[PDB]
Design a protein around this ligand. Structure first.
Ligand SMILES: CCCCCCCCCCCCCCCCCCCCCCCCCC(=O)N[C@@H](CO[C@H]1O[C@H](C(=O)NCc2ccccc2)[C@H](O)[C@H](O)[C@H]1O)[C@H](O)[C@H](O)CCCCCCCCCCCCCC
Ligand SMILES: *[C@@H]1O[C@H](CO[C@@H]2O[C@@H](C)[C@@H](O)[C@@H](O)[C@@H]2O)[C@@H](O[C@@H]2O[C@H](CO)[C@@H](O)[C@H](O)[C@H]2NC(C)=O)[C@H](O)[C@H]1NC(C)=O
Ligand SMILES: *[C@@H]1O[C@H](CO)[C@@H](O)[C@H](O)[C@H]1NC(C)=O
Ligand SMILES: *[C@H]1O[C@H](CO)[C@@H](O)[C@H](O)[C@H]1NC(C)=O
Lengths: 239, 98, 202, 268
C-alpha cells in the first residue's frame, strides 16, 4: 500500500500560492496531512474521510485542504509565510488504525527570491596516487554558488544511479558566512575500485537537482531566471 | 418527534390542610430536552425535585418531578411542560377527583 | 505533549547495543509504533506493540510495551552505521481510523563506524573540464580524527563523511578542502589535528 | 424471580462542539447507579450498588467507563464527519446494555443502540451489526467499529462475563431492598359518572385492582398505567364508567403481596 507526494521539494516566496499534492491508489477513504518541524512530533494539519470532505486537524491555520477525488488530497497555502517552511507528510488509510505515509515534501518559503541562483557543478577525477596507494579511486563532486540550499546530489554510472561508495555532506556550507544571503557549496564523494575507474566504458556523472523558481515566477534581474533545473558534470573512466 | 404525556397525581390520599407530595410524570417524549415546572396558582413552586431522566423499552424518555404540597379548597396545582414537539407549553392541572 | 522520548540524542560505537525509551500520557493507548527516519527521508515502521504487556522483535530491533506504566523501550542490538537516524515513538489512541496518532519528537542516534585499516592520506584531485582547478581530499583516517574548519575564510573544508563500499565490506572517512586563492594540499588541513603517519604524495 | 439489569446511556450532540452523556442503571425497577455528564464518577443510588465487587475491581471498572465516555463522544463526532453531509446534528444516541438473570447460572446479555430514537445497531456475538430496517449508510460506521479489535474483546468480556457476575453480586447485596414489601393505600373519587380507585405506595409492582358489586367483578374496570412514586413505590388507578345513582353497593378491591391475603376493600 503506497503513497506519493508532489513536488518533493519546493522553494516559494512569501505571499505566493503553494499546493502540495498527495496521491494514493489503494482506494483508501482516509487521508491526512502533517508537518514535521525540529523539536516537535508530526502535527496534524488537515484530514479527509473521502472525496469532497475535508476536516481541520490540530494546526489548520494558514492551510486549506482539498479532496477532489478518492485518489487525491491537496494542501493549499494561499498566502505562504516563512513559518510554513517545513517537511510535509501525507498519509492514507482505510477503516483500520494504520496510516501509510508518503515520502515527504520539503518546502522553503523565502521573504524574497532575488538571490536564488543555481549551482555550478564540477567533477574532480581520482588521484593517480590514491589509485596506486589504495587500489581505489575517489571521485569528488562540487556544487558551488547556489542559493537557497535545496539541492539533491546524486551519482550515476552508465545512466543508473549508484548509492554504494557514496557520501554527500549532510548540509551545504556557506561561501560567505559573514553575509546575509550567502551562497552555498556542497561536496560529495564516489569511491570505486581502481579497475572500475580505469574502465573507459564507465561513464560517471554527478547530478545536482536544484530547486529554484517556477516558470510562473516573475524575474526582473539581468541574469538567467534561476529556475528549478539539473546541473551535472561528467567524466569517463580511463587507464 | 413525540409529544409528552403528562400525569399529575398525589402520593397519599389528598386531605385539605395535610402535607402531601404531588407527582408530575412526563413520558413518551423525544428528543430528551424538556422543561418541567410544577405550579401553585400559576406560580412556579421553587423546591421541585427531578428524578434522573430515563427511557423505556420503546426508547421514549420519561422523568418524574415531585414536590411537597398542602392541598386546600382554593389552591390550584399544575404541571407545565415546554417541549419542541409542541408549539405551546402544555399545562395539566391536578384534579384530586381524577 | 503526551509522548516523550529519551534520550534526546546519543552517540554509540558500531557493535554496541542501545536502548531508546518512550513514555506517554495518551489515553486510551491502543497501540504504540516505532518509526525509523533517516536524515532527509520518510518514516519506516520498525514495529507495532498492541498488548497490555507486549514484546516484539524485527531482526536487530526488539521492543517492549507496558501499558500499565505507559512505557515502551526500543532495543537495537549490535548497532551498524545505517542505524544512524531518528527514532520516533507514536501512540494511536484507537484501534481504527477514528484514532489520532500522537508523535514523539524522536531520539537521534549516531553510530560511529569501525575503521579497522586506516591509511590516512591527503590527495589532490583535478577538475574534469578545467585542469587549472583542484580539490584536496583527506581520506582513510579513523574516527578519533576531527576535521577542523580552516582559519582562512577563502578556504573551504567540509565536515567528514563516511562512505560504504558495500560489496567490498569497506568503509572510509573523508573530508574535502578547496580554495580559489597560493593554496596547496600540503597546508590544506593545517588547522586540523591529523595523524603523524599521514601520506602526502609527490 | 427474573431480574433485568439495564445500563441506559443517553447522549445528545447538538452540533460539532456541544454534547452531553447521561446514564442511569436499573436492576428490575430499582435504580442502582446514576452517572451525570457533570460528574467524573459513577454514583451509587443504593448502599449496595457496588455489588460484591472489591474497591479495586470497582475502581478499575469505573475507570474503563470514564475512558469510554470520553472516547464514545469523540468517536460519534468523527463518525459524523465521516458520513457528512448524509447525517447532521442534532443527534441523539441511546444505549441499552445489560443482562437478564434466569434460575440456575443462566443469563442473556444485550447491547442495543438507537440513533435518533430508532433501534439500529447491536453488539452480537463478536461484532457490531445493524438490525433489520436500519438504513444502509450505517454499514460504514459498522465497518469502522468492527475494525477495533480491542473494543470488541472488551465488550465481549463485559457482556459475557462482567455483567452476569456483577448482577449476581448485586442481587445478593440488594436482597432486602429487592424483596421489600410496601403496602398499598387506596382511596376513592369520581368525575363526570366515572369512579376512580386510587392505589398508591405499593411495592413490588404486581397488583390486582377490581371494582366489585359485592362478589361480582365489574367488567368495565379500566386499569391505568403504573405510575412511579418518588420513594420507589408504585401508583395505579382503576376507573369504572357508571350511570349516576348506581354507585351505592360498589367497592374497590385491591390484592397485593404485602397484605398477606387481607385485601383492601373500600366501599363507595
Ligand atoms: C455493558 C454492560 C455490562 C455492564 C456491567 C457492569 C455494570 C457497572 C455499572 C455502571 C455502568 C454505568 C455506565 C452506563 C453506560 C453503559 C452503556 C454501555 C456501553 C458499552 C460499550 C463499552 C465499550 C468499551 C470499550 C471502549 O471504551 N472503547 C472505546 C475506546 O477504545 C480504545 O480503548 C478500548 C478499551 O477496551 N479500553 C478500556 C481501557 C483502555 C485504557 C485504559 C482503561 C480502560 C480498546 O483498547 C480499543 O482498542 C481502543 O480503540 C472506543 O473508542 C469505542 O469506539 C467507544 C464507543 C463504543 C460504543 C459504540 C456504540 C455504537 C454507536 C454507533 C454510532 C452510529 C453512527 C452515528 C453517526
Ligand atoms: C461471548 O459470547 C458470544 C455468544 O453470545 C452471544 O452474544 C454475546 C455478545 C451476548 O450478547 C450473549 O448473551 C449472546 O448469546 C460468543 O460469540 C460466538 O463466538 C464464536 C467464536 O468466537 C462464533 O463461532 C459464534 O458464531 C459466536 N456467536 C454469535 C451469536 O455470533 C463470543 O465468542 C463470546 N466471547 C467471549 C470472549 O467469551
Ligand atoms: C459534558 O461533559 C464533558 C466532559 O467533562 C464536557 O466537556 C462537556 O462540556 C459537558 N457538556 C455539557 C453540556 O455540560
Ligand atoms: C451548540 O453549539 C453552539 C455554538 O456552536 C451553542 O450556541 C449551542 O448552545 C449548542 N446547541 C444547543 C442546542 O445547546
Amino acid at each position: 500500500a503506497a503513497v506519493t507526494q508532489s513536488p518533493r521539494n519546493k522553494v516559494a516566496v512569501t505571499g505566493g500560492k503553494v499546493t502540495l499534492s498527495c496521491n494514493q491508489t489503494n482506494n483508501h477513504n482516509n487521508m491526512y496531512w502533517y508537518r514535521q518541524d525540529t523539536g516537535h512530533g508530526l502535527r496534524l494539519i488537515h484530514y479527509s474521510y473521502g472525496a469532497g470532505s475535508t476536516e481541520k486537524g490540530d494546526i489548520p491555520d494558514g492551510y486549506k485542504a482539498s479532496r477532489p477525488s478518492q485518489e487525491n488530497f491537496s494542501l493549499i497555502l494561499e498566502l505562504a509565510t516563512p513559518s510554513q517552511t517545513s517537511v510535509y507528510f501525507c498519509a492514507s488509510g482505510d477503516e483500520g488504525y494504520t496510516q501509510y505515509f508518503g515520502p515527504g515534501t520539503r518546502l522553503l518559503v523565502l521573504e524574497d527570491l532575488r538571490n536564488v541562483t543555481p549551482p555550478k557543478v564540477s567533477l574532480f577525477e581520482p588521484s593517480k596516487a590514491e589509485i596506486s596507494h589504495t587500489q581505489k579511486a575517489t571521485l569528488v563532486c562540487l556544487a558551488t554558488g547556489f542559493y537557497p540550499d535545496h539541492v539533491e546530489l546524486s551519482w550515476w554510472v552508465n545512466g543508473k544511479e549508484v548509492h554504494s561508495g557514496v557520501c554527500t555532506d549532510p548540509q551545504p556550507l556557506k561561501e560567505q558566512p559573514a553575509l546575509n544571503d550567502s551562497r552555498y557549496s556542497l561536496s560529495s564523494r564516489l569511491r570505486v575500485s581502481a579497475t572500475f575507474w580505469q574502465n573507459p566504458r564507465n561513464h560517471f556523472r554527478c547530478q545536482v537537482q536544484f530547486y529554484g523558481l517556477s516558470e510562473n515566477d516573475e524575474w526582473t534581474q539581468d541574469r538567467a531566471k534561476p529556475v528549478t533545473q539539473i546541473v551535472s558534470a561528467e567524466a569517463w573512466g580511463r587507464a | 418527534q413525540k409529544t409528552p404525556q403528562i400525569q399529575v397525581y398525589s402520593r397519599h390520599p389528598p386531605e385539605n390542610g395535610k402535607p402531601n407530595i404531588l407527582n408530575c410524570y412526563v413520558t413518551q417524549f423525544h428528543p430528551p430536552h424538556i422543561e418541567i415546572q410544577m405550579l401553585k396558582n400559576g406560580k412556579k413552586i421553587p423546591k421541585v425535585e427531578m428524578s434522573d431522566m430515563s427511557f423505556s423499552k420503546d426508547w421514549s424518555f420519561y422523568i418524574l418531578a415531585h414536590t411537597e404540597f398542602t392541598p386546600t379548597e382554593t389552591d390550584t396545582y399544575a404541571c407545565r411542560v415546554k417541549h419542541a414537539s409542541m408549539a405551546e407549553p402544555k399545562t395539566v392541572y391536578w384534579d384530586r377527583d381524577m | 505533549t503526551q509522548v516523550e522520548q529519551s534520550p534526546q540524542s546519543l552517540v554509540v560505537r558500531q557493535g554496541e547495543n542501545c536502548v531508546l525509551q518512550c513514555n506517554y500520557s495518551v489515553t486510551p493507548d491502543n497501540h504504540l509504533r516505532w518509526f525509523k527516519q533517516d536524515t532527509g527521508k520518510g518514516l519506516v515502521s520498525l514495529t507495532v506493540l498492541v498488548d497490555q504487556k507486549d514484546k516484539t522483535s524485527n531482526g536487530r530491533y526488539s521492543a517492549t510495551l507496558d501499558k500499565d506504566a505507559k512505557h515502551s523501550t526500543l532495543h537495537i542490538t549490535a548497532t551498524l552505521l545505517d542505524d544512524t537516524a531518528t527514532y520516533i515513538c507514536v501512540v494511536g489512541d484507537r484501534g481504527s481510523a477514528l484514532g489520532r496518532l500522537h508523535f514523539g519528537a524522536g531520539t537521534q542516534l549516531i553510530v560511529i563506524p569501525d575503521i579497522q585499516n586506516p591509511d590516512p592520506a591527503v590527495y589532490q584531485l583535478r577538475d574534469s573540464k578545467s585542469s587549472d582547478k583542484s580539490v584536496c581530499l583527506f581520506t582513510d583516517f579513523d574516527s578519533q580524527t576531527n576535521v577542523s574548519q580552516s582559519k582562512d575564510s577563502d578556504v573551504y573544508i567540509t565536515d567528514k563523511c563516511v562512505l560504504d563500499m558495500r560489496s567490498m565490506d569497506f568503509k572510509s572517512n573523508s573530508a574535502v578542502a578547496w580554495s580559489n586563492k597560493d593554496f596547496a594540499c600540503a597546508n590544506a588541513f593545517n588547522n586540523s589535528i591529523i595523524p603523524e603517519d599521514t601520506f602526502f604524495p609527490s | 424471580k427474573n431480574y433485568t439489569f439495564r445500563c441506559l446511556q443517553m447522549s445528545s450532540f447538538a452540533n460539532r462542539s456541544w454534547s452531553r452523556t447521561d446514564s442511569v442503571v436499573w436492576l428490575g425497577d430499582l435504580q442502582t447507579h446514576r452517572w451525570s455528564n457533570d460528574s467524573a464518577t459513577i454514583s451509587f443510588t443504593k448502599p449496595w450498588s457496588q455489588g460484591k465487587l472489591s474497591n479495586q475491581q470497582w475502581e478499575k471498572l469505573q475507570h474503563m467507563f470514564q475512558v469510554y465516555r470520553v472516547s464514545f463522544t469523540r468517536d460519534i463526532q468523527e463518525l459524523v464527519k465521516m458520513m457528512s453531509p448524509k447525517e447532521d446534528y442534532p443527534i441523539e444516541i441511546q444505549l441499552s446494555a445489560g443482562c437478564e438473570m434466569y434460575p440456575g447460572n443462566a443469563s442473556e446479555s444485550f447491547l442495543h443502540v438507537a440513533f435518533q430514537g430508532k433501534y439500529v445497531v447491536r453488539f452480537w456475538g463478536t461484532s457490531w451489526q445493524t438490525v433489520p430496517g436500519a438504513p444502509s449508510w450505517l454499514d460504514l460506521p459498522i465497518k469502522v467499529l468492527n475494525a477495533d479489535q480491542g473494543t470488541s474483546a472488551t465488550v465481549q468480556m463485559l457482556l459475557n462475563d462482567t455483567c452476569p457476575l456483577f448482577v449476581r453480586g448485586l442481587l445478593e447485596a440488594g436482597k432486602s431492598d429487592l424483596e421489600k414489601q410496601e403496602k398499598p393505600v387506596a382511596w376513592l373519587s369520581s368525575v363526570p359518572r366515572q369512579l376512580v380507585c386510587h392505589v398508591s405506595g405499593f411495592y413490588p409492582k404486581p397488583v390486582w385492582v377490581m371494582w366489585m358489586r359485592g362478589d361480582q367483578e365489574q367488567q368495565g374496570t379500566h386499569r391505568g398505567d403504573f405510575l412511579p412514586n418518588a420513594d420507589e413505590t408504585w401508583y395505579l388507578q382503576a376507573t369504572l364508567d357508571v350511570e349516576a345513582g348506581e354507585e351505592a353497593g360498589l367497592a374497590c378491591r385491591v390484592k397485593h403481596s404485602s397484605l398477606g391475603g387481607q385485601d383492601i376493600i373500600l366501599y363507595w
